[PDB]
Structures are given as structure tokens and as C-alpha cells.
Symmetry: D2
Subunit: 481 residues, 4 copies
Amino acid sequence: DTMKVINDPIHGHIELHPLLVRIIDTPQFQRLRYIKQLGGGYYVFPGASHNRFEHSLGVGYLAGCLVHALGEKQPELQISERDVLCVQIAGLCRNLGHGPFSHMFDGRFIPLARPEVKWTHEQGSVMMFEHLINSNGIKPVMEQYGLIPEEDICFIKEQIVGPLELWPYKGRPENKSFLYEIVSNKRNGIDVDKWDYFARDCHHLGIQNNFDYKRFIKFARVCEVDNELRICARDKEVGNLYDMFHTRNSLHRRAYQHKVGNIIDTMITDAFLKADDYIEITGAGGKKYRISTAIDDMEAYTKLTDNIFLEILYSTDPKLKDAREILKQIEYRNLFKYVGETQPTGQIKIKREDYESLPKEVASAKPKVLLDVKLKAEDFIVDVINMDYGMQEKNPIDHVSFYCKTAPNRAIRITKNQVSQLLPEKFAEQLIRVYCKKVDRKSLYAARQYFVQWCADRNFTKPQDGDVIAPLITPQKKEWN
Amino acid sequence: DTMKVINDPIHGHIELHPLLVRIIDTPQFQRLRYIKQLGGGYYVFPGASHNRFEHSLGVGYLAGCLVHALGEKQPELQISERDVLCVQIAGLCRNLGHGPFSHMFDGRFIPLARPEVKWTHEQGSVMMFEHLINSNGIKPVMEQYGLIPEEDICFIKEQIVGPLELWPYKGRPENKSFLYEIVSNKRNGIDVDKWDYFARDCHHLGIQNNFDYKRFIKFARVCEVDNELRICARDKEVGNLYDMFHTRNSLHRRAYQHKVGNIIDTMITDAFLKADDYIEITGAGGKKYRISTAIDDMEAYTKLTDNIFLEILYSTDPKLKDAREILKQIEYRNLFKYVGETQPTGQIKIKREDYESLPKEVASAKPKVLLDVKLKAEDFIVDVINMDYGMQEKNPIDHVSFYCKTAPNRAIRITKNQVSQLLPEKFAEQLIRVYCKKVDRKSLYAARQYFVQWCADRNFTKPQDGDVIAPLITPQKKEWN
Amino acid sequence: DTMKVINDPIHGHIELHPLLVRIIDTPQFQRLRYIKQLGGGYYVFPGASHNRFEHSLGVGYLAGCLVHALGEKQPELQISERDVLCVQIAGLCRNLGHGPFSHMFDGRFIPLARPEVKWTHEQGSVMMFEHLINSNGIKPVMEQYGLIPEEDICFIKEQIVGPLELWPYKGRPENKSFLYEIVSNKRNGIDVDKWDYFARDCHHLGIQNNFDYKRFIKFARVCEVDNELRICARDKEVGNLYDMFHTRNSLHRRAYQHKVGNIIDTMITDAFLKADDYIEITGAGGKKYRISTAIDDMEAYTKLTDNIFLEILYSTDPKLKDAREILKQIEYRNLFKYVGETQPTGQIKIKREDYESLPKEVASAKPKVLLDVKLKAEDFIVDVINMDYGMQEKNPIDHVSFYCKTAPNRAIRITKNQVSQLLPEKFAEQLIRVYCKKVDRKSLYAARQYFVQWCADRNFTKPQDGDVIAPLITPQKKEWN
Amino acid sequence: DTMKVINDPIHGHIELHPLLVRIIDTPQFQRLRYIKQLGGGYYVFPGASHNRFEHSLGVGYLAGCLVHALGEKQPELQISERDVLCVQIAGLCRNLGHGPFSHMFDGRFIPLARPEVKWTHEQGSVMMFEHLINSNGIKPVMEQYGLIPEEDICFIKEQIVGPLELWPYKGRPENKSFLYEIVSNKRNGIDVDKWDYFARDCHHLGIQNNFDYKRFIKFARVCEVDNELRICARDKEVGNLYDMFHTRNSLHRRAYQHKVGNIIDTMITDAFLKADDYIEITGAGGKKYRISTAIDDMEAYTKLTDNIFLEILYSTDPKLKDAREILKQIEYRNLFKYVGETQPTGQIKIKREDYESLPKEVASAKPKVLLDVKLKAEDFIVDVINMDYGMQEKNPIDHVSFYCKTAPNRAIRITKNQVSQLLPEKFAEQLIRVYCKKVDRKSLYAARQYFVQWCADRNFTKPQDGDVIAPLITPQKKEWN
Ligand SMILES: Cc1cn([C@H]2C[C@H](O)[C@@H](COP(=O)(O)OP(=O)(O)OP(=O)(O)O)O2)c(=O)[nH]c1=O
Ligand SMILES: Cc1cn([C@H]2C[C@H](O)[C@@H](COP(=O)(O)OP(=O)(O)OP(=O)(O)O)O2)c(=O)[nH]c1=O
Ligand SMILES: Cc1cn([C@H]2C[C@H](O)[C@@H](COP(=O)(O)OP(=O)(O)OP(=O)(O)O)O2)c(=O)[nH]c1=O
Ligand SMILES: Cc1cn([C@H]2C[C@H](O)[C@@H](COP(=O)(O)OP(=O)(O)OP(=O)(O)O)O2)c(=O)[nH]c1=O
Ligand SMILES: [Mg+2]
Ligand SMILES: [Mg+2]
Ligand SMILES: [Mg+2]
Ligand SMILES: [Mg+2]
Ligand SMILES: [Mg+2]
Ligand SMILES: [Mg+2]
Ligand SMILES: [Mg+2]
Ligand SMILES: [Mg+2]
């Protein structure tokens, strides 16, 4: 019936239009309260207890802020209340498809358990939004508030996942192109979802955040680029834009890709793999499903949250023992031991289909060191991490349009050379982390010898503690000294 | 094994001595990651996702800070490393006893389920600590770090719950009395646990803290009082002390006793009660326990967390339907409707024994108005809340010792009218909230009539929205105009 | 001309309409950059470097925010862009009248150097605003942006100082009455000026602000009260409102009325007095003015800032020696020694005309102790502090109008009994601070004896350190022990 | 006399040893209250009201923190309380030499007014420190607290300015080398002064700092490096170290080198140059000094603060007209207009000796466009900014020693390719800003054409607004498109 106010630690008092409230107060949406934003990060950063729910509220809020500011500054855009509401809904709903421990689920588990399926949290969000709409009688409520469900649900879905297949969108015409750059920006990745997670993750992790999203909003316009209306930034802000991505990278460096956080996600993933044959999730009409198969019945996926972790942990079924045991090790803090980090040198990259063979390479290395123990490929974990600016090898700022103070409608491009010589010369790189599942002193020592030798053989970068953990290995490599 | 550093958003970088690390990395301690600090409050303040774990870490840290500060200011106290470690363990482990949704469990659920016991989270903490130590071989580690297991474990337990059974403490002599004022202060309620939850809860709720604990720590000495060495605050800090309690009250007013948060705690408690006979928790020996009986076996209690909620929410068994459905109504936000709030006048108390009778009273009222429906006692909930400065009717500052800059070692007293005339004249009061389980317009209107009439009959305070929700009724009471 | 954006640490990015910019970029306005918000408080709280300027910007911003909120929720109020601009201007300009060290000037210096005049910073703001307008050709700029200079200028002035003397305002009719409640609220003291100095002062002092003005703004409506459209708060907010004043009180208790900050304001005022005959400030037509007379010519007052402190301090003129030596004594931190604080009892109210008679009394007391050093009137300083809720003895909340969610257009009243019984019973009290200019040890002892015996004789409250600084005096007064 | 506690908004409650207090309570130190940290920055960022005084307290506090931490973690360094006091005094006093508006004075004014002298704020701080010691009888107070003035004063001065001209330090031997790395680090620039100004400047500017100095302090050790004991950072902090410098750079781009802030510093400088003949400052023995000569007499320098600004602003002397007017144009916000920014390409670097030749070059340019007005040299201003990581063209991280977890006493080196490929390739660049003193639309158009043409002639980078301000010029430079 009426609008609600929600007090958020990041944004303060957020006003929710009654339709938004209607969408939020569904099992499908409330489900997100039981899925941590940073998954295993919480097991390293105790302040990171926040879940996808509050993040989603923040995203909807910011989407609303940006679209409203745009409309207010430029009424000639003909942004309607319908547009605002659809953008807010998209913002609210683009996190619906996330599984247990967020990125652990779609980044590690699903690719291993369902390697044939090309699953994404975006598609999950579309399906789950469709299921929310259909299971909660949302359409009549949308019509009640002036929305046209066919068009507008199309538009929302497209905001989340892109064109459901020349102007490729069906939800809105070309003159409203800019609206697709708010919730999930496919062009350059500058969107409100990022802003909310910068602020929220920072607030909870104990890290200060360098990015001023409000400033950005106050310096954003719509201009015509390539006969298309796009969101443009004030030229002045180019530095701040570069910094934004820097921030992202920093956050991945300090927290998101923290080696222990990652190894914990890995262990939880192993536990899930070992529990997958014995865990039942009742889906549609009593039809049972698995952790790996919950993602193809939305009624089952709705009940697939962080809860799984605890179910496994609290089980008494002998068939779950192994899985249980793994989780229990996490509780005792008997984790796989981090052995080190290294990088490719020069031009060479590491292809995905090679990942599987990496622990064999390490185990096959021949360090000239005396060792009683002997490790095997299955004792090693090799985690390859692609760090980039969101557009693989490309500089996303080259895909941003700017405007000058004297011609606010004239879109211009700004090159990296026009800003600073102190900026990154590359926008993508790979970090290779090595862990060992054997945790005793001698095993960790051997693992270090194998690892550093492996780095030398592949002509990879010298590990930072190389001279310390493998003093007999490192001065074989002239390139390292 | 070495010290570990943990980054906390409240305290920053916290150092953990390896013994503390050993204690934390047990299932008994890690359990606290799965119990929300503010419970149902998370459903009103979406920022309040924080759990008892991070709060406990915070408490241990602050305990350490206080004892170290005292030690460094006054070497004559003979505060030892052992003392410091024991105080830190006491701070870390004094939240071990909380159950699912924290205070929902010891404050609502347990007194209803098993009204014949006197369960407290303190006792739970002692039992849980005992269980953690015994189940994890912590004693030999304790002596590895120069602790004496018998008397130090006694000392820790005593810091948690007070005298187990004249100087009543067996863990420490009276010349170390001040140590017992740090973790859980029975004398005046001024301890580090409060400080942590002030800062942390404020940080997550999105409301701001006003108490400066670091300042207090700065101006804290140990001075002699009534045969005892006790913690004394510098005189001019007295204002700040009153304010401290004022903050606590404020926190209860805005957040901890939020009408909706409380009614959600209520609905969840009811769901647990209706689920109690069917949820089995496997404890020691493989023996089966229930939610209400897990507190009798620490092995089962270890597995008693917020997960229950989801276990009830995700269930399929008919015997759980009535529980399950309740939780589902929380997801659809079909909550019991808040009817209103009133207070008793004079020095008129409402003892606990009368609580259960209050719903009947409201329904037995005679509103001289048309009513389309008649409500029964079982349609009403009367939640009565005691707001006080932590020592029932007493002024806790009357139990604080102070010192002046002219004589640092000399304890003194400061009376209330020696500070300000603007302070509360009382230090305890009662709030009466009334809800209606029937939600329809007509039943809610009727409920408002019944309620206001019930306020008039018992000469309770006039509901702020009295003239608006029952204009045919408030004229009868001439004291209300 | 276009609007400008200013980044403020409190409010973030605030927009300024070109008219406000034109008003700001004048010598009369920029003047405020050189006057400390907290005067001598900076010599106690090193973070409190902030000046009246930035505060003024904040006040204008918040005024704009509140009026926009009101207008966007209730279009039936017909709030024009003119109204918004005029409210913003009043917000910006209501600090123009402040003198050197802010409240030290109108609160100490002026009343002592010119006892016959009735000078307030508000009237000063009016005169300075008029001077700004006339000196800077602002009227046609106002016209350029749609303002009607005569009534709008009257309106702005009325918002600042009140009626320039049935409905007593010429600027706006009664149906825009609520507009007069935003910048300077004569009705209950709840205005945006308070909100800015709460947030800002707390930011700089290192004390934390617990009042949430954004929340208040979100919950504010305009309702009919005795045929007058007025600003009404949501019922639920009442507690927060009480707290808002409590906060004010706290900020006075901790910082604004800090004993050393006040005695420093006293020494500065004293020095300004002793310099008043000799300092020349050139005004209109080259005519020369004093410090105490600069308030008569706005051209001279424009040049009267904190700079005076440094003129005196840096001076070499023998005629200024006496003043100079005082400021230098502040630099060496040889301040008058604080003897203590006490309060009247029962019904006593130290009236202003009796203030001068206070050092005589203290110096007169016969404490009957061994007394190797006798002291006199001009050795003592007695400062009387009136702590209240901004409406003398009255409860400001009784002058606040509320609304309920069931009938948002229906204004109601709420009494203190409808809220809490932990609230204050008095809303005004007095504090008596005694210092001694004789800083040596024996003199200090003496002054303590004098002061305590004086408190006993006047039936004042027993000083907190009483039983330490006057051991042979405090056991006499039987109502003390 | 005893220890004092000071509440600072950045650090909270700082303890100051009585000796430090004696040093602080001097006109030479208190002088820093009247000098703004960011100078002209205040006129762009209204939050930047903070002064050198509070910053100095901050630096002393942090120096103390780092030395204490080092001493607590590593007893074998034999750090004495004498060392702690000397490092605190150095940190406290290393900003004593700053002049009016800080870096405007030593960076702009002095070089233009006294090109024949080498002047630095470091030399000024040493001089002012000696003056402080000699004017306030500090030596016997130093001796009173266990200091040895002859060697300790040398130690402090050495910490501030470096070797007074094989171990080149006299204050402390090589085994205390690490002590010189705290207050002002000549080796790599990582010192507590930076940490304080990061935190403080950010707090006041309304910018957010992502450098965690506390974390750095916790992971700092002293290890042997080349027969010295030096501060070593834990290996994995290397990323953070890079980020620290990145932060510095960011702070320079957003705030310290704000083009308007710089042009305001330039206008103030020009005003001082035009006032130098006439303003008099009375130093030792009544002798008179100019602003440019005050640095030759510490007694006069003690009176040289931001006050002169106001003096010039408030003067009636016709000889000061030209100075005064400029300041007046600052108040009216009639500033020199910003034409634009460019950068040298290739290897080319601009030396100071070429600066004055730059405005001549811009006016000597020939844009092939119809101009209505001819501009000359005096109409142009060229500001050259050097942006580096504190060590000219070098990577300061190549001058950081690290330590690994497994061998905490063994110092190692970490190269850039060992960390990230996304790091800067250069560590220095130049920014060239061009402004025009004539502010009419015509002269501005002309100036734009001149500037872009000049940029093209010297193969500089294409201005970001190039295609907009000069459409007839940018298509001529093939190197741009
Ligand atoms: C600062 C503050 C925040 N909040 C937060 C908690 C909620 O997220 C948000 C909304 O709470 P409420 O304002 O209490 O809204 P309500 O739904 O409980 O009451 P009603 O329907 O009658 O209007 O505000 C308070 O409730 N009280 C406060 O004093
Ligand atoms: C600011 C910051 C905090 N943190 C937090 C997260 C952790 O809670 C805490 C611990 O530091 P860690 O780097 O996580 O220590 P570690 O145990 O992973 O590595 P090691 O065993 O080699 O010492 O620091 C970072 O990890 N990185 C950062 O840059
Ligand atoms: C975060 C941030 C704030 N600010 C603040 C400082 C100012 O108070 C406010 C406005 O500064 P600018 O945005 O730089 O505006 P400008 O007037 O200098 O330039 P232009 O006229 O071309 O638009 O923004 C920045 O300038 N840059 C930043 O990166
Ligand atoms: C929060 C808070 C800070 N502060 C700050 C301001 C000061 O910078 C710092 C020290 O103030 P005080 O504690 O008041 O020290 P004092 O010198 O005035 O009193 P005394 O000599 O008798 O001990 O603490 C308070 O004074 N009071 C407060 O309640
Ligand atoms: Mg509600
Ligand atoms: Mg994305
Ligand atoms: Mg099937
Ligand atoms: Mg570790
Ligand atoms: Mg307690
Ligand atoms: Mg007022
Ligand atoms: Mg003092
Ligand atoms: Mg430096």
C-alpha cells in the first residue's frame, strides 16, 4: 500500500516505493539474507558478515539515485516514473541468482560439478526473477503502479543479463539507451552495483575506500555518441575513473582474492562435491534435487543457501562423513598450506584448459634438495587468478565518453596518454597461487622446494620469499639474480 | 605457533596470542559465527548482520587493552602476563553461552519452553568454556604458556558468571579485585562488553555511538575501596558515565526493542516452540536432544544455532507445518500488527506473573462503539519491557568510585545532585506494547478500540496516536482531554 | 553564470545556485573564513579549527534540503523556486553578524565594553546582510533570478532575526508559515543551523554526534495547527527529538563550556578590553573606529575578525603592552587556575546584575583554616553558565507538533508522560565556575578554602573534589556529608 | 607538572609527556596555529581549515607510536625512554619552519623573492627549534628528564634536516640507524609525517584515505641491512607500500595541486611580492624585517604567519594598494582564468631555469585563426608541477627492505616485476598548467588558441578539451589523431 523507509549503514535512509516492497517481501528475495557477499572472506575478515540482501537494497537505491539525477538534470531525456521503477527493480534484483557463498558457487563449484553447463549468476538472476514474479503475483501489482509487464519485465531482464538474444534491446527504444548503463554496464563496467559493493565491503572489512560515487553522479550527463545516447562523465573526472578501477583491483588484492579466503572457498567447494550425492533439496512438487542440480529448478534453488554448509556440518549420516570432516578441519583451522605466489613473465599467458595439468607439473619438478618425503600431483593445489580492469585485456576508460564544461552535449574520447604516465601500461595479469594439502613441517618444506623449482623451470617470476624458503633452489636461475 | 593479527572494522588490527588462537579455533568458539548478535533485529535493520563471533573477539581485545593500561599506569598492582591472558580469555569466552538469535533464546524461548529452570547465557558460557577446554586439550597449552589450569580456569569462569558459590572469589585474592571489574562488572555494569557492542552495533545498525571508551580507559586508575582495590574513574568523567547508560537506553529505544524487531523475535520464538518436539539435535553418545533440551548437553548445544530457523523454514514434514508456516509469514511480511504502546503511572509495577493475564484484560475491555467483529484473548500479544540503568531501580553511578587530580590514590563518591539537575529522577520504567494477531482492517480497528479503552480503564498513559485511532474513546478520559 | 559544486567534509558535494555564489563571493561573506566557530575552544580541542564560513555553507545547504523535501512530498504547499532560494539565502547569511571568536564577542566582550547597547549576532547578521546587498549590487541579480527584492529581502531578514516590529510577518503570509521554521526556529529551536553545528563541531572536536537530521527530514510534513501551516514531526520521532536537545546539552558540557576554553575566552576578552582604546579599525569615509565601536559601521565590522588577536599579540606599541602580555601568557599556558564548580540549590537563581558581586563574596568567606596567604576580589573569577533546552525553563517538545501514520494531515500534541519517565524534570540549571588569578600553590590552597566555604554559606552544591581540597570544611555543612 | 591528554579528531586521546608540553607551550610552537596546512587549498576545499599545529601534534604522536612498537616487539634494540622522547620531539617539531600558507611560502614566494638563497622548511624548522630551545630555557628541563642536550639536540635536528655535514650522523650510532627512519625518511620517504597528513588532510578535505598506517606499524621490524639496523616491512605489505605512494599521488591530483588552489597560491604570492617593500615585521632588538627577510631573524619569523594576508587585506596605506587589490580580487573570486593542461612527450624534461621563458613561448605562438585581440607575455601564467614518488625518477620501493615470515631477521629485496604488471612504468612526470590574467571571453578564446598551438609546436600532449576549445588547431597535429 505505502512506501517504506529502511536505515542502511552505508546509504542512510532509503525510501522504497510499495512495489519494491512487494518484490522484496518474497521468499525468492528474502533468500539473499542467507548468502554471504564475500563467502569465505568472512573466515579471514570477521567484519565481513554482510549478505547479498543488504547489498541488493543498496544497488536498487543507487540505481534509483542515478536515474533520478539524470532525469532531473536533463528533462529532455523523457525519463518517466516507469523508467525509474524498472531501473530500481533491476538494481534490486540483479543479485537474485547467487548461490551459497556467492562466488564460490559459480566460480568454483558449478564449473567442477556441472562442467557441461555454462552457468552464470546473471542467468540465475533472470530465472529467479521470473520465478519471483510468477510465484508471488507481481504482474497485477506492476500494472497497478503504471508498469506494462511484457515490455517492462523484458527491460528489467535485459538490464540484468543483456539482450535476450542494429538495436538489440526489446525492453526500451534507442533513445533510452543510456538506461542500460546504470545497473549492469556491459560497455565499460561503470555501474552502481560496483559502487555499493565498494562502500559496503569496505565498511565491513575494515578497509577505507577511495571512490566518491556521489561526485561521479553529480558530474554525469547523457550525450550522443555514435548516434546513441550514453552516460558521459565530465572530462575532469578521468583520473577519478582510473582510480575507480584501481580501487577494484586493490580490493581484489587485499580481500576478495586473499589466499586463505580462497583456500577456504576451495575446501568448502570440495566438501560440497563430496556431499552432492547425499544431500537432498525438495524442489517443485516433491521432486528431489541435488546441490549441483538445484540450479535447474528455481523452487529448489530458492532453498539453496549458506545453510548447506551447516547441514553438512551438523549431519550424522555416515555417507556424509568425508564432507563433514572437511568442514570440521576448517573449524579446527587445519587448512591447506599456502606455498606461494608467482607470475608469468613477458608475453606468455596461461590457458584455462591447462589449469588441470598444473599440479602435475609442480609434482614432477626436480629440486636438487634432499627430501625424505615425496609429494604427488593430488597433494598440490594450483589456483590461477585473472586480475583485470573488467574488460579482459582492454582499458575500460577507452570505452568511456567525456564532456567539456563549454560544450556539455559534445562527447569526446580521452586517451591514457592524455592523463598520466604513471598509469598502468597493462590492464590484465595472472597470479598463480600454490597450496599443499599435506600440512606437516617436512611436507611444507618439500612443497616449497617443488614450487620454487617449478617457477624456475617455467621461467616464472621469482617468489618474494624465494631466497628464504628455497635457498638451494633460487641461485640456479640467473634471471632471478 | 605465533601471534595472529585480525583486522576488525571496529578496533582495527587486533593481536591474538597463540593460546587465544587455540581457543578460538574450536567448534565451540566458531559456533558463534552462526548466531546473530541482535537476532530478529536484522529483519528491521538490514545492516545488523553481525554475529556473536566478531563481537567476542572485540570483547577479548578491549579486556586486554584495559588490563594492560592499568598495568602500565600502576606497576604496583603486580598485574602479570598470566592475569592479562586470563582476562583476555574471559573477554573472548563470555558470549559462548548464547543460543539461536541471542537474547530471543534466553529471554523469550527458554522461559516458555522450560519455565522450571533458571537458564542464563552466563551459565551457558561457563558450561561451554568447560566443554571447549575439555574437548580440545587446552589445559596443557595453558600450562605451555605459563598459566595454572585449575585456579586460572576458576578465575576465568568467575569473571564470566561471578562467584561460583568474606571474599567469595577463589581465582584471585582481593588485592586483584579490580580484575573482576573488566569483563563482566557486577558492581555497576561498566565493562568492556558494553563498549564493544556499543561501537559494533552502532556501526552495523547505521546509528552513531556517543560513548568514548578510549577516553574512559585513559582516565581509569586502581584505588582502594572498602578493603578492596577497585577501578576508579577520574571525577570529571562522571557526566560521561551517566551518558554511557543514556546511550544504552537510547540503543534499546531505537533498535534493541524496536516494536517490529520484538514482534519478529516473538513469532520466531513461537515457531521454535511449535517445532520443539520434532527437531532432533544429536548430542553426546549419539543421544537425541531438542531445541529446548540442547542446553542440557554441550555437545548438542554446540550444534544449536540460527540454522534451526532455516531447518524449520526448509522443512517438508506435516508435523512442522505450523512452525514452518509461521516463518513463511515472516518472509511474506505478514506480521502481527502493532496496536500501540502505553506505560503504567505512579510507582506502579507489573510483575512477571501477571504478563500472561494481560492479553485477556485487553479483550475484556468494553469500548462503547460499534464493532463488526469480537476479538479473543488469543488475538492479542502484550509485550512488556523493562528499561533501566542496569541495576533495577538503582543509580549505578552511586556504585562508581571516583578520584581527583589533587589525590590520585584516594577514592571518593559523587552523588547525583552533585552533577546536574537535568538527569533522570528515576532509573527504571516499563513499556507496554500491544499487537493483534488478526491483521484485517476491521480487526485492527477493533483492536485499537479495545486497546485504548484498556489504557483508559487502567489509567495507563495516553497512546500518542490515541485521538487518531480511537476518537470515540479518548474523550471519556478527561485526564487526556 | 552556472551553478558551482563545493565538496564539504560533512555534507559531501553541495550545489550552489549562481545567486548564492554571487552572495558568497563578497568580502562581507568571505569575512567568516577568519572567525573560529568555537573561539577559544580551539586552544583546548586542536581539531576545532573550523570557521563560521564553512558552517554557513552547511546551513544554507541543509535549509535547501529541508525546503525541497517539504515541497516534493506536498506540492499542495505551492513552494516556489523563489521560496527555496530565499530559504537558502537566510541559511547562508544567518552567521554574518558574528564577531571575533564568535560567542566570546557578543557574549563577553561587547556586554562589558558597551553595557548600554543591546547587541546580538542576529541583528548583526541583518545589518551585515543589508551591507552585503547594497555594497555588491545583488538586487538586480536577485531580479535576474526571479526574486522580488523588497518582500524577499524582508523575508530573508525575518527568517534571520524574526519580526521587524496577529500575523507579524511582511515577507510571507501565514500559509507559508512553516518557511519561518527552517533557518531560525523561534517556536521550538529545531532548525538546520543546529544540525550543521552538531555534525560539523563533532567532526572537528573528535566527539561523536548521535542525532540523525536526515531521518528527521525524511519524517517531516507540514500540517495545520491553529490555522497555520507548520512543520510537524512524525510521532515516532519524539524520543529522538528529546535526544536532540540532550546532545546539545552534552556538546555544551564537553566542549563549548569547557572550563579552560571559557577561561581562555575570558583572558582574550580581558585583553581586548585593555586594548580597546588603542586599536583602530578604519570604516566608512576613512572614519576611525574601536573594537567596541566597529559594530556601528558595517564597513568597519567587515574588517573585525580574529585577526585582532594577532594584531595585539604582534604589536610593539607600549600602549598595547598590557593587552599583549595577556595574550602571551595564553601562549605560555599561564592561565588562571580553575578552583572548582558548584550549583545553586532549591529555588535560587543567580541573576545577571549580581554576577559582579560574586568575587567579593568568595574573597569574603571566613573558612577558619591556617591561612598564610590572603586573597581579594580581583584574584577571583566567577563564571555563571545557564544550561537549558533553548527555551529558558520551558520544555521545547511541548511546542512541537506531531503526526501519526494513520492520519498524516492531522497534527497532535505529545506530553513528556507519553514518552518516558527517564527524561529530565527541569529544562534549565545554572553552573558556577570559580577560578583564581593567583596561580602559586599557597594561593591555590587558599582559593579552594574560600570557594568551598562560600559554597557552604550560599547553600550551594558540594564540589566533587570537596573532601580532598577542603578536608576541614566539608564535614561541617550537614546537608553535604 | 604532569602529563597532558589531548583529544585529536584523527588519533583520539594523545598522551603528552611534560617535556613535550613545555616545548608545545611556546610562542615558537603555538605560532603553528596561525598557518594553514594546505594554504590556498582552503579557498577551494572549505573543510581544509586545519593548521600546522594539530598536524605537528599528530606527527609527534605517530613517531612515538612507531618507536614504542619497535621497542616492544624487539627488546634487543635497546630503545630507551630518552630515544622515545627525542623521536617524539623531532616529530613534534619538524614543521616549525613552515611559513605563511605553508608550501606557498617555500615553494613559490621565497624562490621568487630570494633566488640567491637556498631555503627549505627543514632548515627553517632546525633554526626555529634552536630559537625555541634558547628562548624558553628547555635544556635544563631536558636534563631534568634524563636527556643529554648536547647529543640529543643534535639527534633531533638530524632527524629533521638530515646529516649536518662512513656513518655521517653524530646524534646516534649505526645500531640505532632505524631511529632516523621514523620522522623524516631520506631513504625511501616512508615516515609518520606522511601518515598523519594522509589521515588529517583527508578528514578535512572530504576525501577518503585508503592507507592503513597502523597495519604498517604492526608489520614493521628492525633487521640488519648493510651493517645498519633498519626498519623492514613484512614482504606481503609491498602492495600496500606501492599503494601508499599511489595515495600520495592521488592526494596531489585531487587537492594539493588543484588548478584553482594553485592559481590562488600564485595570486597570494604575487600580492606578497608587491607588499614586501612595505610590510614590516619587528624582530630581535627592535630591528625591522620584510616578509622576504623574516627568515633571517627567528624572532621575526615567529611573527610571520597567515596574518600578513589579512594585514595586507586590511591596510589603508596607499603604498599597499597594488597588493591589497589583488587580495580583494581573490575575495570577489575574480581569479586568473584556467586555460588548460598539457604534458611533455618523449624524454623531454623542463628545468626550473626555463620556467620564465614559458609565458613568452605561448604568446610567441602563431595559431592560424582570426583573433580579435593580441595577447602578450604578461597575460600568461605557466605553472610547472613535478609529480613523482618522492625520489625523482626512482622507484622508492627499490629502497625498502622486507622480511619473510619464516626468517623474520633476514632482510630481502622485492622488485617491481615480483609484485604486479599493473604498476606504474614511470615514477615521475610533469604537468603544465596555463592560465590567463585577462578574463574577458575574447582574451580567453585567444588564450585557448595560443595555448593549443603552443602545445602542438612543442609536441606536447593534446589537451583533454582540445577538440572543443580549438577545432581549427587540433586537426593540424597528426600526432594527436
Ligand atoms: C535512527 C533510527 C533508525 N531506525 C530504522 C530502522 C528501520 O530500518 C527503519 C524504519 O523503522 P521505523 O521508522 O521504526 O518504521 P516502522 O515500520 O517500524 O514504523 P511505522 O510503520 O509505524 O512507520 O528505520 C529506526 O527505526 N529508528 C531510529 O531512531
Ligand atoms: C588492510 C588489510 C587487512 N588485512 C587483514 C585481514 C586479516 O584479518 C588480517 C591478517 O593479515 P593476513 O595477510 O591475512 O595474514 P595471513 O595469516 O593471511 O598471512 P601470514 O600467515 O603469512 O601472516 O589482515 C589484510 O589481510 N590485508 C590488508 O591489506
Ligand atoms: C573528490 C574531489 C573533490 N573536489 C572538490 C573540490 C571543490 O570544492 C569541488 C569543486 O571542484 P571542481 O570539481 O574541480 O570544479 P572547478 O570549479 O575547479 O572546475 P570547473 O569550473 O571546470 O568545473 O570539488 C575536487 O575538486 N576533486 C575531487 O576529486
Ligand atoms: C570527549 C572529551 C574530550 N575532551 C578533550 C579535550 C581536551 O583536548 C582533552 C583534555 O581535556 P580535559 O580532560 O578536560 O583536561 P583538563 O586539563 O581540562 O582538566 P584537568 O587538568 O583537571 O585534568 O580532552 C574533554 O575534555 N572532554 C570530553 O568529554
Ligand atoms: Mg512500518
Ligand atoms: Mg559487473
Ligand atoms: Mg528429477
Ligand atoms: Mg597466517
Ligand atoms: Mg553487562
Ligand atoms: Mg538558535
Ligand atoms: Mg589540565
Ligand atoms: Mg618528506
